[PDB]
């Protein structure tokens, strides 16, 4: 979810990557990430722009 | 039958008839004989466009063969009354009332297709009754002819004497010929 909302945030992804990296910033900066289910966040283009789709 | 078409909008799709769909785009159709029922329907459409957008031009198509004079003189007062300019397009046929409603359009926004036909005559009537009543109707109808002839001269630019000699009897005029009298401004042939 977007920043400033009850939902999750896009920075926790780096926390997970860091733990796997043993908090080695240099290693984590050259790591790989996998964002699954990237098709559920598509924009409902048919709907008018009347609300921010944080999801 | 009148087919129904769909228009896509932000809120969603809505289905409207072909004639109503064009009304949304400020286009009114004048078809058939001129009478009170069709006139009241058309005048209402014109007023609706004024409220929605009094600065956008309105298109008025005329494919009628003529009709009642009283019914057709109300629309003329409505076109000159409202602020927005009312465009008039000659499409196929335009009789006395159709021509009167064709030259009354906004100056510079009058058009007539190449194969359009315009016919102009003097008001027609008739009454059955006592001589005194016939005289009253004759005096009144004689004013209607002069009244309409004066309005044509104002929108065309021709002299009242010439209008009387050209409208005494039925006069058929093609689109290129109408431009020389003043009833119209230009002719629509293609997009540009």
């Amino acid at each position: 979810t977007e920043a400033g909302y009850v939902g999750e945030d896009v920075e926790n992804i780096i926390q997970k990557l860091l733990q796997k990296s043993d908090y080695d910033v240099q290693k984590a900066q050259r790591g790989i990430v996998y964002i699954d289910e990237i098709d559920k966040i598509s924009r409902k283009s048919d709907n008018p722009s009347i609300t921010r789709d944080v999801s | 039958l009148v087919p129904m078409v769909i228009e896509q909008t932000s809120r969603g799709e809505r289905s409207f008839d072909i004639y109503s769909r064009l009304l949304k785009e400020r286009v009114i159709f004048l078809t058939g004989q001129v009478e009170d029922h069709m006139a009241n329907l058309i005048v209402a459409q014109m007023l609706f466009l004024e409220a929605e957008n009094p600065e956008k031009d309105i298109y008025l198509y005329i494919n009628s063969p003529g009709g009642v004079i009283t019914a057709g003189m109300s629309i003329y007062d409505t076109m000159q009354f409202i602020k927005p300019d009312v465009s008039t397009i000659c499409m196929g046929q335009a009789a006395s009332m159709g021509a009167f409603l064709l030259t009354a359009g906004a100056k510079g926004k009058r058009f007539c297709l190449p194969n359009s036909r315009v016919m102009i005559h003097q008001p027609l009537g008739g009454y059955q009754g006592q001589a005194t009543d016939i005289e009253i109707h004759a005096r009144e109808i004689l004013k209607v002819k002069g009244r309409m002839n004066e309005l044509m001269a104002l929108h065309t630019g021709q002299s009242l004497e010439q209008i009387e000699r050209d409208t005494e009897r039925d006069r058929f005029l093609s689109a290129p010929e109408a431009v020389e009298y003043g009833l119209v401004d230009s002719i629509l042939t293609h997009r540009n």
């Binding site: 999750e8 926790n12 997970k16 699954d36 289910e37 559920k40 999801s55 | -």
Partner: protein, 56 residues
């Protein structure tokens, strides 16, 4: 509807779920306890009122 179904596609299969901050003795919230759901059975029951027609 669909929004909830799209969130369980990885819980039934397996993923490092982000447990709510705390609902027990645990005092802090930022901890965000990590748990794996690749060996957690998930039963789902419903009534599906109308499916009988679809089948026919």
């Amino acid at each position: 509807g669909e929004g909830v179904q799209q969130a369980l596609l990885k819980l039934i299969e397996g993923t490092v779920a982000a447990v709510p901050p705390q609902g027990g003795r645990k005092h802090p919230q930022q901890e965000f306890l990590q748990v794996d759901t690749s060996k957690i059975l998930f039963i789902c029951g419903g009534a599906f009122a109308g499916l009988d027609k679809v089948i026919s």
